[PDB]
Enzyme design. Structure first.
Site, PDB file in Angstrom:
ATOM      1  N   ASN A 115       0.794  -1.229   0.000  1.00  0.00           N
ATOM      2  CA  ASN A 115       0.000   0.000   0.000  1.00  0.00           C
ATOM      3  C   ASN A 115       0.824   1.276   0.000  1.00  0.00           C
ATOM      4  O   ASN A 115       0.348   2.318  -0.442  1.00  0.00           O
ATOM      5  CB  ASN A 115      -0.938   0.038   1.211  1.00  0.00           C
ATOM      6  CG  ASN A 115      -1.878  -1.145   1.261  1.00  0.00           C
ATOM      7  OD1 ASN A 115      -2.418  -1.583   0.243  1.00  0.00           O
ATOM      8  ND2 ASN A 115      -2.095  -1.657   2.462  1.00  0.00           N
ATOM      9  N   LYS A 167      11.079 -17.123 -34.090  1.00  0.00           N
ATOM     10  CA  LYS A 167      10.360 -15.964 -34.613  1.00  0.00           C
ATOM     11  C   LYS A 167       9.656 -16.336 -35.915  1.00  0.00           C
ATOM     12  O   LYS A 167       9.998 -17.342 -36.537  1.00  0.00           O
ATOM     13  CB  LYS A 167      11.334 -14.803 -34.852  1.00  0.00           C
ATOM     14  CG  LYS A 167      12.183 -14.434 -33.638  1.00  0.00           C
ATOM     15  CD  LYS A 167      11.357 -13.761 -32.550  1.00  0.00           C
ATOM     16  CE  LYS A 167      12.138 -13.661 -31.252  1.00  0.00           C
ATOM     17  NZ  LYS A 167      11.512 -12.723 -30.282  1.00  0.00           N
ATOM     18  N   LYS A 169       7.256 -13.951 -33.281  1.00  0.00           N
ATOM     19  CA  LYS A 169       6.698 -14.190 -31.949  1.00  0.00           C
ATOM     20  C   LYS A 169       5.426 -15.028 -32.014  1.00  0.00           C
ATOM     21  O   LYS A 169       5.283 -16.017 -31.297  1.00  0.00           O
ATOM     22  CB  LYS A 169       6.374 -12.864 -31.259  1.00  0.00           C
ATOM     23  CG  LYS A 169       7.522 -11.870 -31.190  1.00  0.00           C
ATOM     24  CD  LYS A 169       7.105 -10.592 -30.481  1.00  0.00           C
ATOM     25  CE  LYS A 169       6.858 -10.836 -29.005  1.00  0.00           C
ATOM     26  NZ  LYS A 169       8.125 -11.096 -28.265  1.00  0.00           N
ATOM     27  N   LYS A 193      13.503 -21.833 -27.774  1.00  0.00           N
ATOM     28  CA  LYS A 193      12.464 -21.461 -26.830  1.00  0.00           C
ATOM     29  C   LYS A 193      11.244 -20.808 -27.447  1.00  0.00           C
ATOM     30  O   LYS A 193      11.331 -20.126 -28.468  1.00  0.00           O
ATOM     31  CB  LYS A 193      13.033 -20.561 -25.728  1.00  0.00           C
ATOM     32  CG  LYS A 193      13.257 -19.114 -26.111  1.00  0.00           C
ATOM     33  CD  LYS A 193      13.629 -18.281 -24.895  1.00  0.00           C
ATOM     34  CE  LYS A 193      12.406 -17.858 -24.107  1.00  0.00           C
ATOM     35  NZ  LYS A 193      11.826 -16.587 -24.619  1.00  0.00           N
ATOM     36  N   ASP A 195       8.543 -17.967 -27.567  1.00  0.00           N
ATOM     37  CA  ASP A 195       8.457 -16.591 -27.113  1.00  0.00           C
ATOM     38  C   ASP A 195       7.459 -16.503 -25.965  1.00  0.00           C
ATOM     39  O   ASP A 195       6.586 -17.366 -25.813  1.00  0.00           O
ATOM     40  CB  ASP A 195       8.351 -15.575 -28.190  1.00  0.00           C
ATOM     41  CG  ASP A 195       9.246 -14.347 -28.063  1.00  0.00           C
ATOM     42  OD1 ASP A 195       9.891 -14.126 -26.980  1.00  0.00           O
ATOM     43  OD2 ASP A 195       9.339 -13.528 -29.061  1.00  0.00           O
ATOM     44  N   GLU A 196       7.607 -15.474 -25.139  1.00  0.00           N
ATOM     45  CA  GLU A 196       6.877 -15.412 -23.884  1.00  0.00           C
ATOM     46  C   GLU A 196       5.364 -15.335 -24.063  1.00  0.00           C
ATOM     47  O   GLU A 196       4.613 -15.747 -23.176  1.00  0.00           O
ATOM     48  CB  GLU A 196       7.373 -14.246 -23.025  1.00  0.00           C
ATOM     49  CG  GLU A 196       7.043 -12.891 -23.601  1.00  0.00           C
ATOM     50  CD  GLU A 196       8.143 -12.319 -24.490  1.00  0.00           C
ATOM     51  OE1 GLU A 196       9.328 -12.826 -24.485  1.00  0.00           O
ATOM     52  OE2 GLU A 196       7.868 -11.315 -25.246  1.00  0.00           O
ATOM     53  N   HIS A 286      11.090 -16.534 -17.609  1.00  0.00           N
ATOM     54  CA  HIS A 286      10.968 -15.284 -18.338  1.00  0.00           C
ATOM     55  C   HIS A 286      10.454 -14.172 -17.416  1.00  0.00           C
ATOM     56  O   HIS A 286       9.682 -14.426 -16.489  1.00  0.00           O
ATOM     57  CB  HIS A 286      10.015 -15.494 -19.515  1.00  0.00           C
ATOM     58  CG  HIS A 286      10.325 -14.644 -20.702  1.00  0.00           C
ATOM     59  ND1 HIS A 286       9.859 -13.352 -20.829  1.00  0.00           N
ATOM     60  CD2 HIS A 286      11.080 -14.883 -21.800  1.00  0.00           C
ATOM     61  CE1 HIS A 286      10.320 -12.827 -21.949  1.00  0.00           C
ATOM     62  NE2 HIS A 286      11.065 -13.737 -22.557  1.00  0.00           N
ATOM     63  N   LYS A 326      19.025  -4.649 -27.237  1.00  0.00           N
ATOM     64  CA  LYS A 326      17.959  -3.701 -27.558  1.00  0.00           C
ATOM     65  C   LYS A 326      17.157  -3.209 -26.345  1.00  0.00           C
ATOM     66  O   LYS A 326      16.433  -2.215 -26.438  1.00  0.00           O
ATOM     67  CB  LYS A 326      17.005  -4.315 -28.587  1.00  0.00           C
ATOM     68  CG  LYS A 326      16.184  -5.475 -28.055  1.00  0.00           C
ATOM     69  CD  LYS A 326      15.329  -6.101 -29.137  1.00  0.00           C
ATOM     70  CE  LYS A 326      14.535  -7.282 -28.596  1.00  0.00           C
ATOM     71  NZ  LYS A 326      13.807  -7.992 -29.680  1.00  0.00           N
ATOM     72  N   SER A 371      19.379 -12.017 -23.338  1.00  0.00           N
ATOM     73  CA  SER A 371      18.496 -12.211 -24.477  1.00  0.00           C
ATOM     74  C   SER A 371      17.901 -10.869 -24.870  1.00  0.00           C
ATOM     75  O   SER A 371      17.559 -10.060 -24.006  1.00  0.00           O
ATOM     76  CB  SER A 371      17.378 -13.195 -24.105  1.00  0.00           C
ATOM     77  OG  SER A 371      16.391 -13.293 -25.121  1.00  0.00           O
TER      78      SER A 371
HETATM   79  O1  XBP Z   1      -4.624  -0.667   5.549  1.00  0.00           O
HETATM   80  C1  XBP Z   1      -5.544  -0.470   4.762  1.00  0.00           C
HETATM   81  C2  XBP Z   1      -6.809   0.245   5.231  1.00  0.00           C
HETATM   82  O2  XBP Z   1      -6.832   0.553   6.662  1.00  0.00           O
HETATM   83  P1  XBP Z   1      -7.563   1.671   7.369  1.00  0.00           P
HETATM   84  O3  XBP Z   1      -9.079   1.343   7.091  1.00  0.00           O
HETATM   85  O4  XBP Z   1      -7.145   1.519   8.904  1.00  0.00           O
HETATM   86  O5  XBP Z   1      -7.035   3.003   6.687  1.00  0.00           O
HETATM   87  C3  XBP Z   1      -5.455  -1.013   3.331  1.00  0.00           C
HETATM   88  O6  XBP Z   1      -6.311  -2.156   3.219  1.00  0.00           O
HETATM   89  C4  XBP Z   1      -5.869   0.051   2.286  1.00  0.00           C
HETATM   90  O7  XBP Z   1      -7.295   0.188   2.267  1.00  0.00           O
HETATM   91  C5  XBP Z   1      -5.446  -0.395   0.882  1.00  0.00           C
HETATM   92  O8  XBP Z   1      -5.433   0.495  -0.230  1.00  0.00           O
HETATM   93  P2  XBP Z   1      -6.414   0.614  -1.338  1.00  0.00           P
HETATM   94  O9  XBP Z   1      -7.860   0.314  -0.666  1.00  0.00           O
HETATM   95  O10 XBP Z   1      -6.196   2.115  -1.805  1.00  0.00           O
HETATM   96  O11 XBP Z   1      -5.984  -0.447  -2.415  1.00  0.00           O
HETATM   97  O1  XBP Z   2      11.791 -11.016 -27.796  1.00  0.00           O
HETATM   98  C1  XBP Z   2      12.697 -11.251 -27.001  1.00  0.00           C
HETATM   99  C2  XBP Z   2      14.087 -11.614 -27.516  1.00  0.00           C
HETATM  100  O2  XBP Z   2      14.177 -11.742 -28.973  1.00  0.00           O
HETATM  101  P1  XBP Z   2      15.382 -11.531 -29.859  1.00  0.00           P
HETATM  102  O3  XBP Z   2      16.384 -12.650 -29.381  1.00  0.00           O
HETATM  103  O4  XBP Z   2      14.835 -11.753 -31.343  1.00  0.00           O
HETATM  104  O5  XBP Z   2      15.855 -10.045 -29.563  1.00  0.00           O
HETATM  105  C3  XBP Z   2      12.409 -11.258 -25.496  1.00  0.00           C
HETATM  106  O6  XBP Z   2      12.376 -12.616 -25.042  1.00  0.00           O
HETATM  107  C4  XBP Z   2      13.479 -10.470 -24.703  1.00  0.00           C
HETATM  108  O7  XBP Z   2      14.678 -11.248 -24.594  1.00  0.00           O
HETATM  109  C5  XBP Z   2      12.989 -10.204 -23.276  1.00  0.00           C
HETATM  110  O8  XBP Z   2      13.624  -9.265 -22.413  1.00  0.00           O
HETATM  111  P2  XBP Z   2      14.555  -9.519 -21.286  1.00  0.00           P
HETATM  112  O9  XBP Z   2      15.440 -10.800 -21.738  1.00  0.00           O
HETATM  113  O10 XBP Z   2      15.356  -8.150 -21.210  1.00  0.00           O
HETATM  114  O11 XBP Z   2      13.651  -9.786 -20.027  1.00  0.00           O
END
Ligand code: XBP
Ligand code: XBP
Ligand code: XBP
EC number: 4.1.1.39
Lengths: 467, 109, 467, 109, 157
Positions: A115, A167, A169, A193, A195-196, A286, A326, A371
């Protein structure tokens, strides 16, 4: 004893700012970078953070006196202003071991970052580091296998491992997917692999991909005489569907699967990491969506926290960035969290972004995976930065080779082995890298074609995530 | 000119009709005899829809070609068990199902 | 047809920038706010985003030509500069329906926000809105129950519902927890709740809390003659452990449980939402960690996206902010995403932050929950802003009452009903709110004591999340 | 100067306020009419929070532009069922949820 | 009956959906009895034995109301379920009065039958008599007096 209920709003700094506190070894420590709203004092801001992230709320409640608040409350025990930044501070906060559910990254995150980031009295907040105490680290499984066991399982020693993301993707059928996988693996890459964002889609349903990919692994392995693998993505809408997919990978005897730990979540990921340990499947993690959280240095959570959280939840690989590719990666802090994800003991070092000394009590390391936008010319730098215990991944840098996948794979594998030999012989990869590559290109035509193709391609921009 | 329907406990067949005169009761027992059903008088302290079993008054009137004989047993049963619900049932032994069933006496008050 | 493999790096804007594109009704649309690095043109930046979030990588791959790339690629079909902001733009990107796994929020997020936020060529990026096409919305379950069914289940009509978070956040034993729960509920609140970081801890293990809380619900319900409930937190380290906890809540006949959807994750949450639908348990969704992601307007994901994602994954309640309380909430955009989480059809309205018209194809609404730093004086504003279909939650505003929990609960319930009566009679809650409260305080001593206590307490800071 | 809160059974919306005068009841029925809700009078022998269903008095007042018409039905219902709880409810047929609900009569003693 | 069900919709004959009386009496026997002789006038081509397999309750449903009650009882007898959808919820006073109207109409017809009255000849009279003491029945008789379904049956034997 707890004596006297007085209703009403007090200052947080009255209970929660404790600059005389010395953290116990069982305390969880957090470092926050914050800017208070105008007219909100730093120490009251730090105490508000400690309060709402541990035991406190906005008025006085009588129920406090039913318990022992001194032993449960978070303690903002130190504040320092950021050197050269106006109205920016680090708060260091200690949290009792008792506040956290054993073996739950979900619960740790819910407390520390639940919070406090949306407090009106706070303009911006960023979690930089967490010191996980050893007593807590030991309630987690950690990596299903980790670096040593993985290399033993795969018979892969003495070099970085080499992968390739298929590729485009999205768009390929299951059969063409396996086609691209076979040609990559036969060419000398250790892994391919998903792609994600390949999960299960109209153009390619997951069971079909698993089936055709398994065939491509068997063929390319029988041909090359080296263990091959493909990170099959089991990331799914629900736990049930994730387990189903993981289960068929096991059925096919697939050595490695893949999971997006942030978009799926830590609860699902921890389920999967446990499963993997019991079923001897390696887990490639990933990090999709991480930059939504970790890019800007004024607000969010630094990746090195997310990396520590994942080592705890469980994964055998984790994408660590390239530095040179990149996508953004600051070299200093990258060397920092690579140490955090690999080593057993990492001393505090603020020049690497390491705020706290971290011990891992013999919890296995996580292989870093470089990667994104890298090619053969990057190879000496990648080897120098990451060393042997890494996986270097070339998606476009394999499938975008002029002659296709298998020549593309050979180019990278030759470039890699050349760099490793040169390094072992004592050549400086920094100074002599391009020469080592040009030498190898003399006898490797497919390497020569890749060097030719990508000679001019660099990624050089101002890094937002400055230390 | 709609009325809201009153809540009132009921007792299955014929219990939505105005209470049977003794002539109407006998007309129903005549029907049994003609249909070949065997009369049985049962009584119960309660009328719970969930319970399967009431208590049998003597035995079923298997050899019966006489509505008054049934009516005599009902009178006799009501004497001994006026605190009880009393029900006349017909039994078809060919299909082995109870074919007729109506309350002839609700308990006093 | 697909003709001619040419290896090498091209501009993204060559394939992915398509300003002539008109989105189909089955397209998923995203609105991004971005700043390009110096010397990176806006349209190339927009196309890089569309490319790496759909089908493309950094060089040309031959495998593209095995498929039909025109029908799979993301299309940055519009770019506009942000009015008055230098070097800031909105890119609007269309994604084919085919790119996404049915019923998976995890997969949608992995694609749209997976990697593009960390692009070196991009200084900052923020996802503002997503138009979920109806064809996709229909592959999700959505809320287990939703607003109408929930009110019918609980016999709660004609007013906002009233809850209370038990304090301190951590530290209380299971027995004292239920004690505080009984006193709150007997006083006139509809719900009590676990704090988000109450899971299972040394000082209070979860099964003990569930057991003592169940007893407190039965007692307070038997006393008051109104349905009572307590959101039991089933957020857990693993899916298995989460299900276990949800299962015991069902066993006890508990009408409502609680989940942290971001710190646990969408994969676990979707599992839980399905379970809840099959087992008739209501699902309160806490939004812990959301501000790590959604606070700053230059980088991250706006909450209204997270709120739409949760309506899809599944929850019956979702914390929506207070606007007036201790945590940040911009009134204009809050009214925007409350409509998005409640209504069936929401017209585009940029003054409310609603970039796209959203249809929900009769998917049930999610009750907004206002919680955090609010008290009786806020009541007329809370009722005016949120209306009947909301849950208003007072943690410190109940347990910090001078006379304790039950008087604290009565104060809030009286304050609420007074405001609702006044509203129905035609009084202006804006103008006459304090008077309506002072009038009610004439005959309610416990309300009077609360009005006295919190008269001076306001939260008034500059909102970082400006539209 | 804290009081211990008395135990007292409640009846949902408005039941923590001092009992509605007939003018206050009519102000709430006016609100319904204006909001477009359809009034419905329900009565029940008991007020159990667990039970979903009370008994409907006649039918919902679908064609109603008159608070007194509702008030007349409540008077008439209270005549026939003064031994019962009587409750006025508003129904939104667009969202298909009951929007208003308050007790207008608790049973005698 | 073979696959398994305790009730089966059998048509009304007199209601809004088609049902030929002769063949309806045929297949009601087929779904209820243990032995049904061949009878081509009822559409029963073969003698069917059921070897003590339980009967299936016929359910008459579709466009029927109180005025149909004597005919429904005469056609189907006791071992049937008679279903009134619009004939309950379309009562002027609502569901509970609608239900009472039908239940009173039914029990009246059953009593009259047991006493030896001809439901065919005396049905409307039995209904009018019962309507004398049942206002909710009277309101239903009033409402649906004119409503008949009388078309040429496509499914002729
Ligand atoms: O501690 C809290 C409330 O306590 P209190 O009622 O004692 O203030 C949290 O649950 C906040 O509500 C979370 O934030 P959001 O609701 O903004 O996600
Ligand atoms: O498309 C990708 C790589 O493709 P390419 O090899 O064609 O560039 C992603 O998996 C990036 O690697 C993810 O980012 P991080 O690894 O920075 O989390
Ligand atoms: O809508 C129906 C009855 O409604 P109502 O009672 O309002 O007429 C259907 O269930 C018909 O009964 C089906 O046909 P069969 O019974 O002929 O199969």
């Amino acid at each position: 004893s707890a004596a006297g209920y007085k209703a009403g709003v007090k200052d947080y700094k009255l209970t929660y700012y404790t600059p005389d506190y010395t953290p116990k070894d069982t305390d969880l420590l957090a470092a926050f970078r914050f800017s208070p709203q105008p007219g909100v004092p730093a120490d009251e801001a730090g105490a508000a953070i400690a309060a709402e992230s541990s035991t406190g709320t906005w008025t006085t409640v009588w129920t406090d006196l039913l318990t022992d608040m001194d032993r449960y409350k978070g303690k903002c025990y130190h504040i320092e202003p950021v050197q050269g930044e106006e109205n920016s501070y680090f708060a260091f906060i200690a949290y009792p071991l008792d506040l956290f559910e054993e073996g739950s990254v979900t619960n740790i995150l819910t407390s520390i970052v639940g919070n406090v980031f949306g407090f009106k009295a706070i303009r911006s907040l960023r979690l930089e580091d967490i010191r996980f105490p050893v007593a807590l680290v030991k309630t987690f499984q950690g990596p299903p296998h980790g670096i040593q066991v993985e290399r033993d399982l795969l018979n892969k020693y003495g070099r970085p491992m080499l992968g390739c993301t298929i590729k485009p993707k999205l768009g390929l059928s299951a059969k063409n997917y396996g086609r691209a996988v076979y040609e990559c693996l036969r060419g000398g890459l250790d892994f391919t692999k998903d792609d994600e964002n390949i999960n299960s889609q109209p153009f390619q349903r997951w069971r079909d991909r698993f089936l055709f990919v398994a065939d491509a692994i068997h063929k390319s392995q029988a041909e090359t005489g080296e263990i091959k693998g493909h990170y099959l993505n089991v990331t799914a809408p629900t736990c049930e569907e994730m387990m189903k997919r993981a289960e068929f990978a096991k059925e096919l005897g697939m050595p490695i699967i893949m999971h997006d730990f942030l978009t799926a979540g830590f609860t699902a990921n921890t389920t999967l990491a446990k499963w993997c340990r019991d079923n001897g499947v390696l887990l490639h993690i990933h990090r999709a969506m991480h930059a939504v959280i970790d890019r800007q240095r004024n607000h969010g959570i630094h990746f090195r926290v997310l990396a520590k959280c994942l080592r705890l939840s469980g994964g055998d690989h984790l994408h660590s960035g390239t530095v040179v590719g990149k996508l953004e990666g600051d070299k200093a802090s990258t060397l920092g969290f690579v140490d955090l994800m690999r080593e057993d003991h990492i001393e505090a070092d603020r020049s690497r972004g390491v705020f706290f000394t971290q011990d891992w009590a013999s919890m296995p390391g996580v292989l870093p995976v470089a990667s994104g936008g890298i090619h053969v010319w990057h190879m000496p730098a990648l080897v120098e930065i990451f060393g042997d215990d890494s996986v270097l991944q070339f998606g476009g840098g394999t499938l975008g080779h002029p002659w296709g996948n298998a020549p593309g794979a050979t180019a990278n594998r030759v470039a890699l082995e050349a760099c490793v030999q040169a390094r072992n012989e004592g050549r400086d990869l920094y100074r002599e890298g391009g020469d080592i590559l040009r030498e190898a290109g003399k006898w490797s035509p497919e390497l020569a074609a890749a060097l030719d193709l990508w000679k001019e391609i660099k990624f050089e921009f101002e890094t937002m995530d400055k230390l | 000119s709609m009325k809201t329907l009153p809540k009132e406990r009921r007792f299955e067949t014929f219990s939505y009709l105005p209470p049977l005169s003794d002539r109407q009761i006998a007309a129903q027992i005549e029907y049994m005899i003609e249909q070949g059903f065997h009369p049985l008088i049962e009584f119960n302290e309660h009328s719970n829809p969930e319970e399967f079993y009431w208590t049998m008054w003597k035995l079923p009137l298997f050899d019966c070609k006489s509505p008054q004989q049934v009516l005599d047993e009902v009178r006799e049963c009501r004497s001994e068990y006026g605190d009880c619900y009393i029900r006349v049932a017909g039994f078809d032994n060919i299909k082995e199902c109870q074919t007729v069933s109506f309350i002839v006496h609700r308990p006093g008050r």
